[PDB]
Amino acid sequence: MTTINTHLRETLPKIPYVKAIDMYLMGCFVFVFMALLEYALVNYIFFSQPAR
Amino acid sequence: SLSFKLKRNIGYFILQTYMPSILITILSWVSFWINYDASAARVALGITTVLTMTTINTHLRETLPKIPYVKAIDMYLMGCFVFVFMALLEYALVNYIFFSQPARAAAIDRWSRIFFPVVFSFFNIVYWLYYV
Amino acid sequence: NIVMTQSPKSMSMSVGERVTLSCKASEYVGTYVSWYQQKPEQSPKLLIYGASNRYTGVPDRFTGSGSATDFTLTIGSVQAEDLADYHCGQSYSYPTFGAGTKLEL
Amino acid sequence: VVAEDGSRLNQYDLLGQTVDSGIVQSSTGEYVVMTTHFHLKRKIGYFVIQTYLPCIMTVILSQVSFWLNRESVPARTVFGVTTVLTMTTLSISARNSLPKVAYATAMDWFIAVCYAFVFSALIEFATVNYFTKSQPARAAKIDRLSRIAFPLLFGIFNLVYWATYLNR
Amino acid sequence: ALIEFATVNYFTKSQPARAAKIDRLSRIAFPLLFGIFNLVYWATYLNR
Amino acid sequence: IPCTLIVVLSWVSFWINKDAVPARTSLGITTVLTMTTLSTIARKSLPKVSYVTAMDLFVSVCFIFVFSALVEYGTLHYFVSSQPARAAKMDSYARIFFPTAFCLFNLVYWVSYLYL
């Protein structure tokens, strides 16, 4: 996701506001980040409750 | 003839290429503090460090002309890459003798912990007294 | 508008001494402040234009200084004909004048 | 006089204009010069999205590695190395927009502190792994302290930085 | 090199002697062939 | 050449031991990121036209192949816990179905585009 955003930002100029493509890339980033945090949570709490 | 003598300021390059590579070499040294029982972790450190150095170089060279001889920044980046590569090769050497004789493997890890920073400091002193 | 606060309201000094009149501008006026000398029952006379530019016929003791909001008029070695009112005005925008400054002995 | 619709400014804001008149002494004489000053304030939005949010995100990701189990050395090692790599890429990217000045800007200081936090997290993991299997109590205690210290220190730094750079 | 590792891993835990044999042969073969190629390549593009 | 080489590199996973999860996962995902970088460059060769060229159809099919290899490993690993025989035969089935499909796609693509 980082490298896709990197390659994209090169073409455009530097504008202060967020474009629709930028919001989509932010959303996909946040979802990937949340999947990683889901694994982090699962690993933290597994040792206590294997069912949870 | 009107001539000008220009001295190049170095702070930008410290911020851009010198500090990152130094920090990446420090990172490389962490491998020797990780138990030599872990293969995935140590190889991850070494390979990631090598590739990060290559990235620093590639981003740097895209802003210079195609010059035959070696620039001083090139000398520093090559030396840092050699240091990272030597850390990776030291881990490979440890892994080659892990099972057969863990005592000498631990001795090699300890010696590396001692002597990678020292040799790096010597190289830095030579480099920074040759040019500065 | 632009308020020109001129201080002091009045002041007295003997003949031969150096004085400094000061004028404060509310907003930025650049170097577009002029100093006027008004003797009693007479019309004003331009002394300093720009901010430091002696108008023709102005003796060399009068001198102005300052930029932006802070300005001053130093009369070095005042004589007996330097007794008058002294007005500061800005011409950066539509003109405004300071309340004035009376000079006695 | 500036026209109402006449703004081709992408990255800046035209706050107003100022004029003045003066004199410059050249080698050929004394010349009148007329000056106009156009006051421009840079808009921070582009740099927020492109540098500040990524740096904060990488700091958060680096600190998330503390909550992992100590019995996963490869996972935390991957976290540390990849976060450091991302920080290096971001630091190389950030300067590319500005001229090659010889001093450090506010963005440079922010990136430096973020790099310090990522590096510190990795060194904390290295220490924890070193004390694991010999003094597990010490390793667990320092990890537990880190879980609080790192986010709080980062938050305090962010508060101070933004307060001192949004009020000047 | 990647293919050789894949073959070793495929033949590991089934024919360990074979895996060790191919690994210890590659350890000498690969550097030797790369050096031979380098020598030939440079000799043909520089002696010109 | 780089795209097909990346595809065969993705194939290599089918021979790795099914138990080595990090190895095969990393193999697949790195293949994917290399694929996306290659796609970016290749399309950057030419102007920004909205229709599909012959080159990016090839690149997209290569990306689909790499994605297929990674998801196939994911499903195999998931079925390990449920049914061992299913995963065991799935590995060998993929080993043959992937290269055959790629050769078939190559034949169709080159026949259609070269003879036009």
Ligand SMILES: *[C@@H]1O[C@H](CO)[C@@H](O[C@@H]2O[C@H](CO)[C@@H](O[C@@H]3O[C@H](CO[C@H]4O[C@H](CO)[C@@H](O)[C@H](O)[C@@H]4O)[C@@H](O)[C@H](O[C@H]4O[C@H](CO)[C@@H](O)[C@H](O)[C@@H]4O)[C@@H]3O)[C@H](O)[C@H]2NC(C)=O)[C@H](O)[C@H]1NC(C)=O
């Ligand atoms: C940037 O780069 C430029 C170009 O390389 C430099 O310019 C050179 O500057 C030096 C010194 O400033 C010049 O050297 C001068 O040459 C003069 C003429 O030389 C005649 O005489 C000598 C013998 O004395 C012969 O060998 C030569 O062929 C000529 O016939 C000298 O007169 C100058 O003074 C010398 O003699 C006097 C005698 O009293 C001594 O006092 C002096 O110390 C000195 O020895 C001087 O030697 C050189 O010519 C320039 N190059 C060119 C191509 O013109 C800039 O200096 C350099 N730095 C900067 C900041 O721009």
Ligand SMILES: CCCCCCCCCCCCCCCCCC(=O)OC[C@@H](COP(=O)(O)OC[C@@H](N)C(=O)O)OC(=O)CCCCCCCCCCCCCCC
């Ligand atoms: C755009 C271009 C891109 C093209 C990319 C495609 C590349 C294709 C390039 C494909 C070539 C790939 C080579 C890697 C294969 C490794 C060997 C292997 O898998 O099989 C050998 C096996 C058979 O013998 P055994 O079974 O051990 O016999 C004893 C007993 N079991 C019995 O059988 O009785 O073991 C050996 O002997 C090992 C010796 C070979 C090692 C490598 C040397 C040659 C290449 C060395 C280096 C190769 C050089 C390659 C460069 C030209």
Ligand SMILES: Cc1ccc(-n2c(-c3ccccc3)nc3ccccc3c2=O)cc1
């Ligand atoms: C359009 C756009 C801009 C920036 C980012 N981005 C976000 C990031 C930051 C805030 C919200 C979502 C993603 N983190 C990162 C963390 C590390 C490295 C790169 C990025 C990144 O490039 C993603 C998309």
